[PDB]
């Protein structure tokens, strides 16, 4: 007895191409997406070169069109130099990404004034998402209000953050957010097992009280999104571990387990992995696209999932119930029981579809 | 030819009593105030014990009444435990101080939710001031808007901060701010002379561009306030230098020098050291109180000013023009040409005066 789900959308993935293709590329990362029941991904701009200008976006578009196996949109990244220069290409992107905490030299912003400049110059009808932790959530919300527009908060990871967003929504402010599976299914209690290298992630793993607060405030969470952030095991366990977890292949099984346990409903899941991603990012439908899952199959997550080049997972050893059996993408069988059946290049840039443009006033 | 000024008000001083009296006490710190032409001070709550509860405020009130030589009001400090407990004593304080960056364990807040709780529980008609640097300015402004009240930003030190506040004022938001003299008259260029211990201050010294931005945006600065933060030279130059500069004795001479050079007007100075402090904090007039200054006297700041127990100054070697000749406080000569003539205990808590209560609806 399989359950048919719509094509699920992950609005936060790092596919590492260009420039980091030993960690992941479009072909491997979108294989991982399909195996996770995800038929559309929005890829972040912190590649090498970073997607911070029209030439880099043009390159990334061709790499994605040639390598992706599922459909996609590409984010642009905000830099210290590019505010006011992205207007001609802005509508071709998923949205604009602001990295407001750590970051590489090219996506680093050193002043809130630079944030304001981006909010003032990026077209007001197009999405803006932010990596904004702790007080940075409040700070970017202030910039959004000063510029009288919306903002979407990436990977909310803490009680403090979800409660701040809840208070802002109670005041009618235009803010949405997403939560990643590691902030719902891992905590400080897992750091001994993971160790300090594997355990490195931003936002960091929270306390049990953080995790419980996210679940209790499910109504405040608009989307789930993986923050799939692959790095090899050698990198994670070496002298300067980079932050991030792979997550495309584990997200849906973890969440289906929670549905099976009554922690959220199937509808709650589908709002957060399909309907709300569509409406916040104005992402188009995918014709003849669906995912068949077996909700009864119990399995234990292994030391690596089959497709991501990360070749490791922080969820190793967790018992899950639910698995992706088949994915159909735009009328073609894309995945069956561990086999990807669409080639690199099958996927398309949804922003080029007539229905994938973000509506705007003339 | 002396110029008569009104009694000037410094809304940000650290007088170190109780608990740090080798650095300063009420008697020495208020001698320094009078010698700087300051007749009223608002004392911060990061003492030992910190002024975070009614018993500590009661102690501090008696120490100040016995030791102060000029008039004063005492801030309460926000803690992780005291939101909703200060209502009976709130109106007796200068206001509530939030330390939103560094801090000692007792004034440290670990979550923006704790800031919200303070803004929700502190009486809405009473002042709130914050140590809030860089993005923390935007974050606390967001909390103020969510709770629909005002906030005052302490020691604005950077271009980024003054421009953010300027943008908030252009949107009609109820925010005021102050600037300390070291952020107008010192910069990174002075760090070689000061060295890394003496140079430690929070907010840190800014670049030349930061200093220039504060001067260019004088219209955005509501108050000047010293952040007089005395520590001994041994402490400043030892193994863990604490942040802060003494400043009561140098503030007015530095600013009078700037007036003499046409960098701001006498009126600009008096708005920022008298009228705006009064109106933001609802501080009462001082009857028969005035300061006589000699605007022609040129002198060089020495290695220590006469009164602060800090016994050092970062402004050593600067040439100034303008000096305090005489101060009259409530009809008594309080200071003449280097001699303080009112004893410890002459000063009074202005919040106990009938005219010093903050007006409120029944
Ligand atoms: Na393609
Ligand atoms: Na007294
Ligand atoms: Zn992020
Ligand atoms: Zn995101
Ligand atoms: Zn990310
Ligand atoms: Zn549906
Ligand atoms: Zn401060
Ligand atoms: Zn202050
Ligand atoms: Zn201070
Ligand atoms: Zn006047």
UniProtKB/Swiss-Prot annotation, chains A, B:
- In which domain of life is the source organism classified? Eukaryota
What does the record say mutating residue 227 to N does?
Abolishes dihydroorotase activity
Q: Where N6-carboxylysine occurs, residue numbers?
A: 97
Annotated residues that bind (S)-dihydroorotate are located at 16, 46, 202, 231, 243
Name the residues annotated as catalytic in the UniProt entry: 227
Q: What is the effect of changing residue 103 to A?
A: Abolishes dihydroorotase activity
* Residues given in the record as Zn(2+) 3 binding sites: 97, 131, 155
Give the consequence of mutating residue 14 to A: No zinc-binding and no catalytic activity
Any idea what job this protein has?
Multifunctional protein that encodes the first 3 enzymatic activities of the de novo pyrimidine pathway: carbamoylphosphate synthetase (CPSase; EC 6.3.5.5), aspartate transcarbamylase (ATCase; EC 2.1.3.2) and dihydroorotase (DHOase; EC 3.5.2.3). The CPSase-function is accomplished in 2 steps, by a glutamine-dependent amidotransferase activity (GATase) that binds and cleaves glutamine to produce ammonia, followed by an ammonium-dependent carbamoyl phosphate synthetase, which reacts with the ammonia, hydrogencarbonate and ATP to form carbamoyl phosphate.
**Protein name as catalogued:** Multifunctional protein CAD
Q: Which organism is it from?
A: Homo sapiens
Provide the taxonomic classification: Eukaryota, Metazoa, Chordata, Craniata, Vertebrata
Interval of the full protein contained in this chain = 1460 to 1821 of 2225
